[PDB]
Ligand binder design. Sequence first.
Ligand SMILES: Nc1ncnc2c1ncn2[C@@H]1O[C@H](COP(=O)(O)OP(=O)(O)OP(O)(O)=S)[C@@H](O)[C@H]1O
Ligand SMILES: Nc1ncnc2c1ncn2[C@@H]1O[C@H](COP(=O)(O)OP(=O)(O)OP(O)(O)=S)[C@@H](O)[C@H]1O
Ligand SMILES: Nc1ncnc2c1ncn2[C@@H]1O[C@H](COP(=O)(O)OP(=O)(O)OP(O)(O)=S)[C@@H](O)[C@H]1O
Ligand SMILES: Nc1ncnc2c1ncn2[C@@H]1O[C@H](COP(=O)(O)OP(=O)(O)OP(O)(O)=S)[C@@H](O)[C@H]1O
Ligand SMILES: Nc1ncnc2c1ncn2[C@@H]1O[C@H](COP(=O)(O)OP(=O)(O)OP(O)(O)=S)[C@@H](O)[C@H]1O
Ligand SMILES: Nc1ncnc2c1ncn2[C@@H]1O[C@H](COP(=O)(O)OP(=O)(O)OP(O)(O)=S)[C@@H](O)[C@H]1O
Ligand SMILES: Nc1ncnc2c1ncn2[C@@H]1O[C@H](COP(=O)(O)OP(=O)(O)OP(O)(O)=S)[C@@H](O)[C@H]1O
Ligand SMILES: [Mg+2]
Ligand SMILES: [Mg+2]
Ligand SMILES: [Mg+2]
Ligand SMILES: [Mg+2]
Lengths: 456, 456, 454, 454
Amino acid sequence: MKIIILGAGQVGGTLAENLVGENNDITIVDNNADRLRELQDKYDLRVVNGHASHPDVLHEAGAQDADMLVAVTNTDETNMAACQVAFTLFNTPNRVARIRSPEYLAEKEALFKSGAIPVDHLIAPEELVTSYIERLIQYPGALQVVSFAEQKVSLVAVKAYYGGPLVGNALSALREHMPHIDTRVAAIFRQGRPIRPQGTTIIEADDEVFFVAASNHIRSVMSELQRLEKPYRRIMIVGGGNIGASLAKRLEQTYSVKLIERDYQRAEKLSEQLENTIVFCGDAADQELLTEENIDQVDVFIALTNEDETNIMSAMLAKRMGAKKVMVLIQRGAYVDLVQGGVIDVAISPQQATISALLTHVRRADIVNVSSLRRGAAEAIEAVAHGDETTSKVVGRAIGDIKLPPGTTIGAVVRGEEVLIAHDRTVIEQDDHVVMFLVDKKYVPDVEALFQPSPF
Amino acid sequence: MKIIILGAGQVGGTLAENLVGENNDITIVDNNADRLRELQDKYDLRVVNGHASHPDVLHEAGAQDADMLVAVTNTDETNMAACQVAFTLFNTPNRVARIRSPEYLAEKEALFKSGAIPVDHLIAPEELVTSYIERLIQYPGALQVVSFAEQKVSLVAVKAYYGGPLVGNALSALREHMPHIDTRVAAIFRQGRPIRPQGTTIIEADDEVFFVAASNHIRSVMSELQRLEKPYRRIMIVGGGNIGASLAKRLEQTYSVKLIERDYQRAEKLSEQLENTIVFCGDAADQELLTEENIDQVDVFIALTNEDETNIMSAMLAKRMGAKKVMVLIQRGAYVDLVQGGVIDVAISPQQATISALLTHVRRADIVNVSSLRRGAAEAIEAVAHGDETTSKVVGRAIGDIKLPPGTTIGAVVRGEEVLIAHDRTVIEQDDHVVMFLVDKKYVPDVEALFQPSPF
Amino acid sequence: MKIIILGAGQVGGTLAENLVGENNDITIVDNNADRLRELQDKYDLRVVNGHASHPDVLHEAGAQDADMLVAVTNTDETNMAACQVAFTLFNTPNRVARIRSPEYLAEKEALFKSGAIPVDHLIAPEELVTSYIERLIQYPGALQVVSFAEQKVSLVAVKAYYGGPLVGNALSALREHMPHIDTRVAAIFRQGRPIRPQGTTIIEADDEVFFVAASNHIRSVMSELQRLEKPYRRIMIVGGGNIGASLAKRLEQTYSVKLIERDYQRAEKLSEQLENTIVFCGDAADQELLTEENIDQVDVFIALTNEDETNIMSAMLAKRMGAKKVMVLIQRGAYVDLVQGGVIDVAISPQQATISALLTHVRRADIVNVSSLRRGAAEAIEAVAHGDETTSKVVGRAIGDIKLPPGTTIGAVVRGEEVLIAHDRTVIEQDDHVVMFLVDKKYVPDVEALFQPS
Amino acid sequence: MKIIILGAGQVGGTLAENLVGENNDITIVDNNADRLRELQDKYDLRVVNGHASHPDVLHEAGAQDADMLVAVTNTDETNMAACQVAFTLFNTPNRVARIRSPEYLAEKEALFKSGAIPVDHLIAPEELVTSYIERLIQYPGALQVVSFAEQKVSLVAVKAYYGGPLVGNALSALREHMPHIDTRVAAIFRQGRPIRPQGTTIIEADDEVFFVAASNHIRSVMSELQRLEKPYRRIMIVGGGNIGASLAKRLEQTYSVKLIERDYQRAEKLSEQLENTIVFCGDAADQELLTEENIDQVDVFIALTNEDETNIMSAMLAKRMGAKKVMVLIQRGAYVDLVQGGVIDVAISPQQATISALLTHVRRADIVNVSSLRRGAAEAIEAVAHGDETTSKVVGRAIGDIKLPPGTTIGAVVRGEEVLIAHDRTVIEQDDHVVMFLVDKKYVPDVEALFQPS
Ligand SMILES: Nc1ncnc2c1ncn2[C@@H]1O[C@H](COP(=O)(O)OP(=O)(O)OP(O)(O)=S)[C@@H](O)[C@H]1O
Ligand SMILES: Nc1ncnc2c1ncn2[C@@H]1O[C@H](COP(=O)(O)OP(=O)(O)OP(O)(O)=S)[C@@H](O)[C@H]1O
Ligand SMILES: Nc1ncnc2c1ncn2[C@@H]1O[C@H](COP(=O)(O)OP(=O)(O)OP(O)(O)=S)[C@@H](O)[C@H]1O
Ligand SMILES: Nc1ncnc2c1ncn2[C@@H]1O[C@H](COP(=O)(O)OP(=O)(O)OP(O)(O)=S)[C@@H](O)[C@H]1O
Ligand SMILES: Nc1ncnc2c1ncn2[C@@H]1O[C@H](COP(=O)(O)OP(=O)(O)OP(O)(O)=S)[C@@H](O)[C@H]1O
Ligand SMILES: Nc1ncnc2c1ncn2[C@@H]1O[C@H](COP(=O)(O)OP(=O)(O)OP(O)(O)=S)[C@@H](O)[C@H]1O
Ligand SMILES: Nc1ncnc2c1ncn2[C@@H]1O[C@H](COP(=O)(O)OP(=O)(O)OP(O)(O)=S)[C@@H](O)[C@H]1O
Ligand SMILES: [Mg+2]
Ligand SMILES: [Mg+2]
Ligand SMILES: [Mg+2]
Ligand SMILES: [Mg+2]
């Protein structure tokens, strides 16, 4: 697998970090020499200093031979130009590009899906975020929904609280309750540190507990944990930009939505374009605006401006003034787990989201796929069981008898269209998709080795 | 009292906001028309659009007749030029100027105190902050030390916690304990909202409780509340700029200080200039640097970079990694109370500090002086009891019999050199300094009226 | 004619300014509200605020109906995306784009000429500039060569001097002293004011005289006016960049070229890429370097750095130190007419060159285009004679019987591939290309009326 | 001589460049590491990185021991603080400061001349520029007036023309045809190269000839060279700013002045402040406005906006439209020598003017200062003859017996308040001020050796 990453920013670099290994040859292009040196010190990859869409720069990165091209530069127009130039001159297969402009996506069918602009897969960070928040809204009480390249399976995170079904009970004590639907804990995060879920792991308060669920039965699982809270009525959105306006349009038909936008010329525009949203012109930190429009009633306050501090301060104010749940948009995913949990209920990063999507396309045709759950060294992953018992170290063997790396816990198996909750006696069959959670991502290539069969 | 404020930034504007009234005529100079319109809408003051140090602009603000000149522009050199031009051309008395440069203050004696540069009072925001943090370090457990223009009296804030002397006990129940030293609660802040301290006010957890103390006996009061924790051993400072390097120099002789500075060229300089400080070159968010230098041992982690988010994220990480107490430098005082309390122990603003100092010079020769305790509408103040019983509405009368405005509580009286803890039977004598806390600062001019005697 | 210009910078703005008029609907798209306003204040055109390559912005500027799209934004990648989006979504005809990157141009065949990236016409200023200089070197004595028609016609500017062939002679007296060559004076600039060339106009010293010539007979005209100087032998180029390195390749095999380049790692690279050029490592203003390499022998000194300040100081030093002629590259177009002529013989601007080229695409699409000449010597336009005698006020008539506005001079008529030097007896036939020069831009729209049929 | 220059911009940099040499220890302070490096790369001087007014930065540049402090930073308030801090902390002598604000200058008496703000010498470029133009208007025909000594000596530049008094005459032939007036040609610039003025130098057309004259007898010299033109009657100023409004006040009472100002609220203000000036509201490039107000009658058109582009286009239009002479204000100093002379008669730069003034303070402190003339016509310096015959190689000798370097011409000798036009028999006495002109800057340090005693 020969991979070229155009632009070594947060997204390109983090991607590069997640793809270094045996079966992957990573080359990164960037015109900033400082960024290249920094990345090369940490990881085994090749670097090209130049403009990502220049024919020679692209040639020097070996676009004729490469198997995938990922364009994550500063600009859509450079990403588009890179994919055009690469395709036209070198026939480079699998061209993925980040496109941040909703204007382009509005014509994505006519522009990209016709091969006019030769992009195979658009990664639209603004769209992904809007979809994620909306999906959280759909499951009141849900702290995080984890996705895999296998769309049939998901994880749902919830926060344990005093006098809740979860707090105090060990994991094995929950397994005594089998009514209607049964799930298994995939991961724990207390105090920002990952705990490997064992039978005798006592759930403490303020833990972030991730349960395994079929993607089409999340509501049903949360219900059966007495953790599905009543539907959100009142949503308040701060920041009427690309993301804010998008989310409001998606919600206004089913929810009661208020939006605050401090630019009057932009705000007036949003009032007509949003038929069922009440749009206010005002500042996010304005106590008297938040009070006048009853912030004490708001079920979820969502801060979606582009400045993290504005969002943070705003949401912290909303919580102080009685908003039930608050969500903030944090730019860099590193800060997400940090700022989350205490006072701020949920933090979402457009960079994380982009990276999550990008890992579902690259890890495709690989053994292991990384999930959208990545916190520090911790991360949930999916691996494929190729081969039969004769050639594989996992196929045929039972889950309780698999030589997993340290810190690694198998949470569920996806066989065809059925999602099986992991048990010790369960036998891994061929071409299964095994979902694991690792406390430390350094053992991924070990998981890779484990699931890699002998040469047929 | 005729006051000219040069520069209507955060400091100038906030000052202007605090000084509007009957006995004060406020004029603000600024070259940004937008900033002027905004301020005039809210407050009764005069605005001049021009350069603060131009002879005509200064003339147009009435510098010949004015009684005080406050220079808080963007630049020290403009502040200095304004004070020179005002003095030389109009003999304007009482010239206060903000000087941010330690280089100038290093020669403050030869430059200002000689009348070469005609500044009467330097307001040095970097120095004030360094002094404040240091003063907090001196009283382990102290959340905030409140100062007044009467240097003889102070307030000390502490946070109530479960199984602590404070939590659960009503205020009257504390008055049953009179050993050695006795104090009175001046203010309460729970959930960021001010509560007027009454006899039957039950102290809840995480409340910010302010006790009255003589400025020279703070340690003695905290001791007698079982709230003076053991001396801080290990201090870790992030950001080796003006403030960070300053604080380290002050502490290194009495504390074990580590400093982190990400710029290697600046960091190397600090290693030699700080004889007893260990200086590290590295990033604030670097988990492995913080761990290698045992952040789990750090008694107080102090984030003093100029970026609030950097400081916030950094300190939140330090707390997660086990640092006992964390303090952050937040630029705008509005965010200070917001970000404080939850996870971040203390937030300090250089703007607040400047404003605090500026209010001790202006309110001088006034009736009321505002303290360094200002949180939203809430603020602690000091008023002077001028006149005798014949002409005053407060002198002679007992504290329990004073027609105070709503939300107002007298906490202590400073008579000469003795600080008297307020009791209901205490009689106000002449020229006393009465310390009150108001839940809403809108009643200040009422306090002013109350302490204003009849025309002699 | 509905024309869309993307980006209202120097080039986009000047262009619109050159085409705003009667038969032209100019819409300018730009990301900057302020540049649009200035343009609307000055001219009656439509302005659209948005990103030049966004589908809605292109549609809102009416790309569906438009007849030409000109992309002159900040970056090639936006120009390309814009041409792409316009073609794919709206089938916008005649898509012209500025492409500054030699890297993209190196693959011009594979990228653009195949319709992968749908640019119909590339305007590459660096190349045009390089080409212009080379064209000047080819005609020693030429201060300026301007093109009209499809470049089929040219003007050759020369400066008249004391004890010279031009000075002293009336214009009609020159038509009688030229035996087998046909030319016409198109414009003159003496003192600080432009003069309309008449029969009784005596050429005074230091005048810049513009002659009309067929492009394939420029050398023959200059020769027989005793104004074609002997071939340049020694050329010195300062600055080995895109333009410098390029111009050197074009010259080194037929001329003796030395190049000065202060970037030492760059100088080494060029030393290899230039088979017949001597590359010196040094600063352009270094006298001890310039005197060492015989600047007094240098026929043409060419300063091609990106710094106008360097170019000017460099050339003036060279001129001071005895170089015969000096040519500079000027970025800021305002100064070009000034900088040329006195101490510095020739000044060349990449923005001007772009505007020229964009107007050669105007000249092929049969729109009349105004252009100002050097130092306001005259404003030049080329117009088409539409209609027959019945519907046109010009077709059929001889030049001597046409009521042209004051200050207006017809210089030549272009019939197909045939260039007729304008004479009083010359009859304009239908669809002819009449190239004229005006002393005043205030009479510009009047000429349009002549050539616009009923 | 230990000299500190605060701020290494155009002015600070040029200054250092003019004074770096043998007897001068130049230290430049600047906030920008890059500007310092370029300066150190080019010249051997000391560079200090810090804020020009910080006590340690001033001390580290050796303000205690320094002999002159020049403040040419970005803002007056920093220049002032620097002069303040230097005086208060280190007693730094001769503190020169650039002050651009007319507001500060309006209170020059009360603020600076009293030692409240310890600036010894104010350099106010806007005023100097205004003063220069006014001085040009006073001597019609003067293209340039440059000053030497304590302004006691001047050069008057004029352009020679066909059928003119200068052209055709050898220089020695002019000394014999001037009856009761004494002058000397100091420099000439013909073609693109400077010529050393000798007896047998015949003046050709379009040469710029510089004459030496006592400052109090400039008019008498120009008159008796048949080169003093008749007084200007009609003046037109574009741009009513600090310089424009100021120049108008100085001219309106003795000349007929019209002013064009596109800022309408500004035009109204000036209409009141200018008792004898007609203020028109309009753009400078508006032909219908320029033709309405008889631009063909205008003796001098002066474009004083902050936009070079406006000034150039404005003036060239005026020159095109028949105005006798046009003068412009040019911000970017690189273009000045070029822009002047051809279509635009006079170009004036505020940065150059500042450098001149800063060098008049150099001329009072008895340091020899180099300055380049217009278009490199010659480099001019004024030097002092220190010592007696025993210790000096120049004192006592007559000019005709002094071995000057090649290209070097002594133009005048200044003894006290007495200006002696240089002659071969003229003997240099002690502490004389000898003003010389060099064609080449490479012979500059050689001249110092002559005047430096043992
Ligand atoms: N035209 C270009 N050619 C090559 N590399 C580029 C180009 N533009 C940007 N880059 C590099 O690509 C990386 C990403 O660019 P940024 O300016 O960080 O854009 P961004 O929108 O912040 O995206 P990220 O990845 O979330 S920081 C940067 O590190 C740049 O150095
Ligand atoms: N304090 C505030 N209160 C209310 N609205 C705010 C506040 N701060 C920012 N906004 C709005 O929220 C968004 C923050 O984004 P900005 O960084 O200002 O712009 P931007 O995000 O670059 O533009 P977009 O939306 O991505 S096309 C803007 O639309 C602001 O109008
Ligand atoms: N030279 C000047 N003359 C007059 N007013 C000025 C000048 N410079 C700045 N101001 C105004 O003074 C105010 C404070 O300036 P800022 O640029 O905000 O400086 P600051 O260091 O941020 O100080 P603050 O008050 O904490 S925001 C601004 O609102 C400016 O509009
Ligand atoms: N992530 C980080 N880790 C460690 N040190 C940091 C980090 N970010 C900033 N710093 C340092 O902390 C300070 C932050 O201030 P900046 O805004 O970069 O500079 P500055 O404060 O304007 O300069 P000063 O100190 O006020 S003269 C700087 O000295 C940085 O070197
Ligand atoms: N004083 C000088 N003497 C000699 N060469 C110089 C001098 N100043 C600049 N140059 C050279 O002129 C060249 C012009 O290169 P640049 O214009 O900077 O880059 P480029 O590759 O030509 O791309 P463009 O077209 O300018 S965006 C540079 O390589 C410089 O080294
Ligand atoms: N506060 C400062 N302290 C020290 N040096 C400074 C300061 N501000 C500017 N300088 C330097 O002073 C020089 C003058 O810079 P500018 O004032 O920006 O140029 P300018 O206003 O065009 O005036 P000049 O000198 O004609 S370029 C610059 O090179 C700066 O690097
Ligand atoms: N095309 C034009 N026609 C007439 N007047 C103009 C034109 N362009 C600019 N101006 C005027 O020229 C004047 C010059 O003013 P400015 O230079 O902008 O300000 P100023 O008060 O002179 O301060 P300085 O010295 O430039 S920092 C302006 O008031 C403009 O209105
Ligand atoms: Mg295509
Ligand atoms: Mg004829
Ligand atoms: Mg003083
Ligand atoms: Mg003689």
